[PDB]
């Protein structure tokens, strides 16, 4: 099919999603950037998503239609729930683009996460079927894990969903281009690790080094001390490095960074479709840009050494990885405008 600047899909439907991308590209994310919009997007396919719950189905009781765009159609209902803090200013900012080119919530949300991930350096290209209903009801409450949620109560929301530990790993991979706004207010946009716009194994090592500095004037729930200036270390990301039942994957990261992108994609795939039969959707995955970048060596930041890091793999020591020379530079913001 031709679509619209010379581009052309096997699928006619498809060509819609070129004009998308054009305006989400060039309008909702500045030009390309991995940045805050993208961040938030990102953390949408997850909050939209995750409203799925085989356990509640079996007891006969509504668990949530997934990646099905509810979160969007009944932000009302949804943005209130307490897990989804913070949501509610780029599901307005989302709604009417989907709303213009009539394109449905749940195919939105999933599109503006993987167009935005790939716009980050070492970006994943995630897959992106089309064809999702806006018809859904909304989510149930409780569905979306927490950051003081423990490792057992995480794992097991995720396991009710249909992912395993090391699923629950990769798809954390996440973090390394990621910030937080609603635990410490005071702290909004201070990252999860020390490079937001690249998707790389940073986050992984940086959660393993010891808790040292309280950011603000005070912790907050559902974060513990953070290793690094400007950075921001949540309860459950230190909880999950530390865990017997993720640390060895949480460490693979570090040992094979290779496999991050691939492993992030797989299950983001799988995220995407919660609540929907992908054969009775339309494969419109090349409208997602090529993500540029190398794979980069994961590094121990300035001013820390091995002994900073509190290795948690019992197979496995922790890698040999360089160290930054000089003395550590406070991590920037992620700009918001
Ligand atoms: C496994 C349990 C998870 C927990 C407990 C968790 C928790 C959090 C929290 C507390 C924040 C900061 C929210 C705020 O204060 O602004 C956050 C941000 C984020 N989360 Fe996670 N998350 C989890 C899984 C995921 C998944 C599966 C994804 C997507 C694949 C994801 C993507 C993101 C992104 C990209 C951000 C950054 C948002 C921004 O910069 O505005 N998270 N997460
Ligand atoms: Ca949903
Ligand atoms: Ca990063």
New binding site residues.
Partial sequence: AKCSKGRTASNDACCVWFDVLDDIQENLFDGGECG?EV??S??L??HDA?GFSPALTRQGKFGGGGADGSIMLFSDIETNFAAN??VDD?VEQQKPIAIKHQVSFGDFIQFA?AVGSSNCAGGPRIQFLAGRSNVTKPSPDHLV???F?SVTS?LAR?GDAGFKPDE?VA?????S???????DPKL??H??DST?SDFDSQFFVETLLKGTLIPGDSLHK?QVKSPLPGEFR?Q??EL?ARDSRTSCEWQSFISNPNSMVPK?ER??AK?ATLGQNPKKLIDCSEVIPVPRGRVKQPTLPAGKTIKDIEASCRKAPFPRLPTDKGTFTSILP?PSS
Avoid: K, W, Y
């Fill in positions: 805050e961040h938030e990102l953390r396919t997850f995750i803090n913070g780029i996460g894990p927490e950051p949620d995480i995720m629950v798809l954390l991979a996440s973090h281009v990621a910030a937080q706004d609603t635990i909004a946009g990252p999860f937001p559902g949540l459950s990301d999950l992030f299950a983001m995220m992620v």
